[PDB]
PDB file of C-alpha atoms in Angstrom:
ATOM      1  CA  UNK A   1      93.460 118.723 101.158  1.00  0.00           C
ATOM      2  CA  UNK A   2      94.855 118.113  97.652  1.00  0.00           C
ATOM      3  CA  UNK A   3      98.521 117.811  99.132  1.00  0.00           C
ATOM      4  CA  UNK A   4     100.259 116.025 102.118  1.00  0.00           C
ATOM      5  CA  UNK A   5     101.638 117.514 105.007  1.00  0.00           C
ATOM      6  CA  UNK A   6     104.680 117.183 104.176  1.00  0.00           C
ATOM      7  CA  UNK A   7     104.287 118.479 100.761  1.00  0.00           C
ATOM      8  CA  UNK A   8     102.705 121.599 102.217  1.00  0.00           C
ATOM      9  CA  UNK A   9     105.447 122.034 104.832  1.00  0.00           C
ATOM     10  CA  UNK A  10     107.898 121.897 101.523  1.00  0.00           C
ATOM     11  CA  UNK A  11     105.810 124.775  99.802  1.00  0.00           C
ATOM     12  CA  UNK A  12     105.743 127.044 103.048  1.00  0.00           C
ATOM     13  CA  UNK A  13     109.620 126.386 103.702  1.00  0.00           C
ATOM     14  CA  UNK A  14     109.737 127.570  99.957  1.00  0.00           C
ATOM     15  CA  UNK A  15     107.875 130.833 100.859  1.00  0.00           C
ATOM     16  CA  UNK A  16     110.281 131.995 103.450  1.00  0.00           C
ATOM     17  CA  UNK A  17     113.255 130.769 101.337  1.00  0.00           C
ATOM     18  CA  UNK A  18     111.404 133.223  98.572  1.00  0.00           C
ATOM     19  CA  UNK A  19     111.279 135.947 101.423  1.00  0.00           C
ATOM     20  CA  UNK A  20     114.457 135.403 102.303  1.00  0.00           C
ATOM     21  CA  UNK A  21     115.733 136.320  98.645  1.00  0.00           C
ATOM     22  CA  UNK A  22     113.733 139.424  98.554  1.00  0.00           C
ATOM     23  CA  UNK A  23     110.795 138.012  96.336  1.00  0.00           C
ATOM     24  CA  UNK A  24     107.487 138.342  96.753  1.00  0.00           C
ATOM     25  CA  UNK A  25     106.604 135.492  94.241  1.00  0.00           C
ATOM     26  CA  UNK A  26     107.382 132.205  95.360  1.00  0.00           C
ATOM     27  CA  UNK A  27     109.323 130.827  92.047  1.00  0.00           C
ATOM     28  CA  UNK A  28     110.584 126.894  91.507  1.00  0.00           C
ATOM     29  CA  UNK A  29     114.148 127.508  92.403  1.00  0.00           C
ATOM     30  CA  UNK A  30     112.931 128.229  95.971  1.00  0.00           C
ATOM     31  CA  UNK A  31     110.630 125.068  96.450  1.00  0.00           C
ATOM     32  CA  UNK A  32     113.627 122.893  94.685  1.00  0.00           C
ATOM     33  CA  UNK A  33     115.866 124.370  97.893  1.00  0.00           C
ATOM     34  CA  UNK A  34     113.109 123.658 100.362  1.00  0.00           C
ATOM     35  CA  UNK A  35     112.775 120.236  98.791  1.00  0.00           C
ATOM     36  CA  UNK A  36     116.307 119.326  98.946  1.00  0.00           C
ATOM     37  CA  UNK A  37     116.645 120.335 102.595  1.00  0.00           C
ATOM     38  CA  UNK A  38     113.320 118.475 103.737  1.00  0.00           C
ATOM     39  CA  UNK A  39     113.928 115.089 105.250  1.00  0.00           C
ATOM     40  CA  UNK A  40     111.618 113.183 102.761  1.00  0.00           C
ATOM     41  CA  UNK A  41     113.246 115.079  99.905  1.00  0.00           C
ATOM     42  CA  UNK A  42     116.985 114.663 100.841  1.00  0.00           C
ATOM     43  CA  UNK A  43     116.259 111.044 101.179  1.00  0.00           C
ATOM     44  CA  UNK A  44     114.124 110.716  97.732  1.00  0.00           C
ATOM     45  CA  UNK A  45     117.447 112.376  96.206  1.00  0.00           C
ATOM     46  CA  UNK A  46     120.250 109.892  97.937  1.00  0.00           C
ATOM     47  CA  UNK A  47     118.053 107.005  96.629  1.00  0.00           C
ATOM     48  CA  UNK A  48     118.175 108.060  93.387  1.00  0.00           C
ATOM     49  CA  UNK A  49     121.784 108.598  93.386  1.00  0.00           C
ATOM     50  CA  UNK A  50     121.681 112.728  93.210  1.00  0.00           C
ATOM     51  CA  UNK A  51     124.666 113.780  94.945  1.00  0.00           C
ATOM     52  CA  UNK A  52     123.616 115.762  97.393  1.00  0.00           C
ATOM     53  CA  UNK A  53     126.502 118.212  97.726  1.00  0.00           C
ATOM     54  CA  UNK A  54     126.608 118.823  94.123  1.00  0.00           C
ATOM     55  CA  UNK A  55     123.015 119.636  93.954  1.00  0.00           C
ATOM     56  CA  UNK A  56     122.899 122.049  96.879  1.00  0.00           C
ATOM     57  CA  UNK A  57     125.816 123.632  95.341  1.00  0.00           C
ATOM     58  CA  UNK A  58     123.997 124.148  91.866  1.00  0.00           C
ATOM     59  CA  UNK A  59     120.918 124.921  93.570  1.00  0.00           C
ATOM     60  CA  UNK A  60     122.642 127.751  95.793  1.00  0.00           C
ATOM     61  CA  UNK A  61     124.505 129.314  92.866  1.00  0.00           C
ATOM     62  CA  UNK A  62     120.975 129.876  91.042  1.00  0.00           C
ATOM     63  CA  UNK A  63     119.499 131.277  94.066  1.00  0.00           C
ATOM     64  CA  UNK A  64     122.117 133.966  94.636  1.00  0.00           C
ATOM     65  CA  UNK A  65     121.933 134.412  90.834  1.00  0.00           C
ATOM     66  CA  UNK A  66     118.235 134.883  91.230  1.00  0.00           C
ATOM     67  CA  UNK A  67     118.309 136.935  94.379  1.00  0.00           C
ATOM     68  CA  UNK A  68     115.996 140.594  94.214  1.00  0.00           C
ATOM     69  CA  UNK A  69     117.294 141.717  96.875  1.00  0.00           C
ATOM     70  CA  UNK A  70     117.715 141.437 100.635  1.00  0.00           C
ATOM     71  CA  UNK A  71     115.642 139.489 102.946  1.00  0.00           C
ATOM     72  CA  UNK A  72     111.875 140.717 103.091  1.00  0.00           C
ATOM     73  CA  UNK A  73     110.309 141.866 106.119  1.00  0.00           C
ATOM     74  CA  UNK A  74     109.082 138.674 108.135  1.00  0.00           C
ATOM     75  CA  UNK A  75     105.352 139.616 107.889  1.00  0.00           C
ATOM     76  CA  UNK A  76     105.586 140.604 103.559  1.00  0.00           C
ATOM     77  CA  UNK A  77     102.948 138.541 101.922  1.00  0.00           C
ATOM     78  CA  UNK A  78     104.541 135.902  99.291  1.00  0.00           C
ATOM     79  CA  UNK A  79     102.066 134.361  96.546  1.00  0.00           C
ATOM     80  CA  UNK A  80     102.777 132.140  93.933  1.00  0.00           C
ATOM     81  CA  UNK A  81     104.696 133.111  90.712  1.00  0.00           C
ATOM     82  CA  UNK A  82     102.503 132.184  87.446  1.00  0.00           C
ATOM     83  CA  UNK A  83     105.858 129.774  87.276  1.00  0.00           C
ATOM     84  CA  UNK A  84     104.923 127.960  90.353  1.00  0.00           C
ATOM     85  CA  UNK A  85     101.183 127.763  89.358  1.00  0.00           C
ATOM     86  CA  UNK A  86     102.016 125.769  86.528  1.00  0.00           C
ATOM     87  CA  UNK A  87     104.626 123.523  88.936  1.00  0.00           C
ATOM     88  CA  UNK A  88     101.589 122.551  91.167  1.00  0.00           C
ATOM     89  CA  UNK A  89      99.456 122.242  88.241  1.00  0.00           C
ATOM     90  CA  UNK A  90     101.722 119.758  87.069  1.00  0.00           C
ATOM     91  CA  UNK A  91     102.556 117.938  90.372  1.00  0.00           C
ATOM     92  CA  UNK A  92      98.607 117.793  90.644  1.00  0.00           C
ATOM     93  CA  UNK A  93      98.393 116.068  87.270  1.00  0.00           C
ATOM     94  CA  UNK A  94     101.267 113.910  88.053  1.00  0.00           C
ATOM     95  CA  UNK A  95      99.627 112.703  91.537  1.00  0.00           C
ATOM     96  CA  UNK A  96      96.506 112.087  89.207  1.00  0.00           C
ATOM     97  CA  UNK A  97      98.063 109.828  86.769  1.00  0.00           C
ATOM     98  CA  UNK A  98      99.750 107.501  89.447  1.00  0.00           C
ATOM     99  CA  UNK A  99      96.940 107.176  91.538  1.00  0.00           C
ATOM    100  CA  UNK A 100      98.087 109.209  94.273  1.00  0.00           C
ATOM    101  CA  UNK A 101      95.226 111.000  96.043  1.00  0.00           C
ATOM    102  CA  UNK A 102      97.580 113.560  97.553  1.00  0.00           C
ATOM    103  CA  UNK A 103     100.411 115.265  95.653  1.00  0.00           C
ATOM    104  CA  UNK A 104     103.589 113.696  97.547  1.00  0.00           C
ATOM    105  CA  UNK A 105     107.038 115.032  97.302  1.00  0.00           C
ATOM    106  CA  UNK A 106     107.883 112.777  94.065  1.00  0.00           C
ATOM    107  CA  UNK A 107     105.215 114.692  92.109  1.00  0.00           C
ATOM    108  CA  UNK A 108     106.272 117.953  93.238  1.00  0.00           C
ATOM    109  CA  UNK A 109     109.722 116.685  92.063  1.00  0.00           C
ATOM    110  CA  UNK A 110     108.181 116.369  88.973  1.00  0.00           C
ATOM    111  CA  UNK A 111     106.308 119.248  88.403  1.00  0.00           C
ATOM    112  CA  UNK A 112     109.392 121.169  89.305  1.00  0.00           C
ATOM    113  CA  UNK A 113     111.351 119.379  86.507  1.00  0.00           C
ATOM    114  CA  UNK A 114     109.446 121.629  83.995  1.00  0.00           C
ATOM    115  CA  UNK A 115     110.969 124.937  84.897  1.00  0.00           C
ATOM    116  CA  UNK A 116     113.665 125.527  82.662  1.00  0.00           C
ATOM    117  CA  UNK A 117     116.017 126.306  85.308  1.00  0.00           C
ATOM    118  CA  UNK A 118     115.030 123.253  87.856  1.00  0.00           C
ATOM    119  CA  UNK A 119     115.766 121.274  84.604  1.00  0.00           C
ATOM    120  CA  UNK A 120     119.247 122.351  83.736  1.00  0.00           C
ATOM    121  CA  UNK A 121     120.195 121.889  87.767  1.00  0.00           C
ATOM    122  CA  UNK A 122     118.846 118.297  87.242  1.00  0.00           C
ATOM    123  CA  UNK A 123     120.769 117.697  84.221  1.00  0.00           C
ATOM    124  CA  UNK A 124     123.914 118.870  85.787  1.00  0.00           C
ATOM    125  CA  UNK A 125     123.427 116.116  88.640  1.00  0.00           C
ATOM    126  CA  UNK A 126     122.066 113.224  85.786  1.00  0.00           C
ATOM    127  CA  UNK A 127     118.659 113.657  87.053  1.00  0.00           C
ATOM    128  CA  UNK A 128     116.876 112.872  83.830  1.00  0.00           C
ATOM    129  CA  UNK A 129     113.234 113.102  82.777  1.00  0.00           C
ATOM    130  CA  UNK A 130     113.316 109.362  82.350  1.00  0.00           C
ATOM    131  CA  UNK A 131     114.380 108.849  86.174  1.00  0.00           C
ATOM    132  CA  UNK A 132     111.839 111.004  87.496  1.00  0.00           C
ATOM    133  CA  UNK A 133     109.488 108.957  85.329  1.00  0.00           C
ATOM    134  CA  UNK A 134     110.765 105.916  86.917  1.00  0.00           C
ATOM    135  CA  UNK A 135     110.627 107.541  90.463  1.00  0.00           C
ATOM    136  CA  UNK A 136     106.836 108.021  89.809  1.00  0.00           C
ATOM    137  CA  UNK A 137     106.159 104.674  88.434  1.00  0.00           C
ATOM    138  CA  UNK A 138     108.040 102.503  90.906  1.00  0.00           C
ATOM    139  CA  UNK A 139     106.140 104.638  93.848  1.00  0.00           C
ATOM    140  CA  UNK A 140     102.586 103.513  92.152  1.00  0.00           C
ATOM    141  CA  UNK A 141     103.742 100.058  91.782  1.00  0.00           C
ATOM    142  CA  UNK A 142     105.267  99.678  95.434  1.00  0.00           C
ATOM    143  CA  UNK A 143     102.190 101.754  97.294  1.00  0.00           C
ATOM    144  CA  UNK A 144      99.275 100.150  94.969  1.00  0.00           C
ATOM    145  CA  UNK A 145     100.493  96.660  93.935  1.00  0.00           C
ATOM    146  CA  UNK A 146     102.704  95.990  96.650  1.00  0.00           C
ATOM    147  CA  UNK A 147     104.252  92.092  96.392  1.00  0.00           C
TER     148      UNK A 147
END
């Protein structure tokens, strides 16, 4: 119970995306795809002035470019890559820093931004590290210091 349910559902949707791209290992780009499609993540991107159509286009190009092969069989086991283990460690660090007891979508977003491919994509849609830090700070202020 270190993760909110909506974050777990994004991670699970990510594993299925990874599987469909022929990967046995979940990579940050698969999680980003799931996050961008999710109800909470999609709202998060639109509030923070990320063009949804452009973001989707860039994510899909990166996904197809990193495709390993045909979709794996439905029962194949997907595990976290070393990259994703770092994503989750960084997400957990971010949630802890901003006093969120469980990792929320914003904290996962921050963790994903450390991946080189995700970072390039964010650069192309104007989502700076400064902007992501602002998302986390504002979440802290709004939730724990409401006016």
